[PDB]
Amino acid sequence: GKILNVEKARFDKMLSSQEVATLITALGCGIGRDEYNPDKLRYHSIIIMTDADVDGSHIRTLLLTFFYRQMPEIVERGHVYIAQPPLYK
DNA sequence: AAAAAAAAAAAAAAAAAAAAAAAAAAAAAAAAAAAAAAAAAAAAAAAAAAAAAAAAAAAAAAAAAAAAAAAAAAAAAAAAAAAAAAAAAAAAAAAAAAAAAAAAAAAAAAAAAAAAAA
């Protein structure tokens, strides 16, 4: 579902299961900002495929905030992508 | 080779949790005024000291409020039953240092493979 707003949440508060899962799977080690190393990114194409409704847009904005604030080099290098599934058939 | 326990199939019973978004309150941790407390200067009312003095305890003795005796009568407090408040004694406990077992990196060297030379 929805994840923490890192702009509002404290750095120590970032100990949820979902952010830990994203940090482990990406393996950039975004936590700490001293073990962070974007060269060890396991996937060079990270795709934010949220639902087509407005809540999907909100979750997309939350993920964009997390990637921009915690992993600025990944966003700057252009590894982040956004999928566009259809709402209607 | 016998016993026992896990797990999985599918219709049933019953539960639990994480975040977003704004506005108000309540804990809980800090700077920072603000006043006690303490160290170290100079400074100044009190004891000392002395001579000089006169105000209240002694003493005579009456008398007038008194503390023991007598009586009647009212009924506060003490000790025995129960029923609550509030504190040491003793035992327990959750993190927390210590120990032991498994995952990841390491190169030495060779089997098998791929590739090419004459």
UniProtKB/Swiss-Prot annotation:
DNA gyrase negatively supercoils closed circular double-stranded DNA in an ATP-dependent manner to maintain chromosomes in an underwound state. This makes better substrates for topoisomerase 4 (ParC and ParE) which is the main enzyme that unlinks newly replicated chromosomes in E.coli. Gyrase catalyzes the interconversion of other topological isomers of double-stranded DNA rings, including catenanes. Relaxes negatively supercoiled DNA in an ATP-independent manner. When the enzyme transiently cleaves DNA a phosphotyrosine bond is formed between GyrA and DNA in an ATP-independent manner. In the presence of quinolones this intermediate can be trapped and is used as an indicator of drug toxicity. The chain holds residues 448 to 536 of 804 of the full protein. Mg(2+) 1 binds at residue 51. Belongs to the type II topoisomerase family. This is DNA gyrase subunit B. It is found in: Cytoplasm. Changing residue 55 to C/H: Alters metal-dependency of ATP-independent DNA relaxation, prefers Mn(2+) and Co(2+) over wild-type Mg(2+). Mg(2+) 2 binds at residues 51, 53. Consists of 3 domains; the ATPase domain (residues 1-220), the transducer domain (221-392) and the toprim domain (393-804). ATP-binding is cooperative, and both subunits must be wild-type at residue 103 for supercoiling to occur. Non-hydrolyzable ATP analogs (and ATP-binding) induce dimerization and enhance ATPase activity. ATP hydrolysis induces domain shifts that are probably part of the mechanism of DNA cleavage and rejoining. The record marks 2, 5 as: Interaction with DNA. Residues 1-86 form the Toprim domain. Transmembrane segments: none annotated. It comes from Escherichia coli (strain K12). Heterotetramer, composed of two GyrA and two GyrB chains. In the heterotetramer, GyrA contains the active site tyrosine that forms a transient covalent intermediate with the DNA, while GyrB binds cofactors and catalyzes ATP hydrolysis.
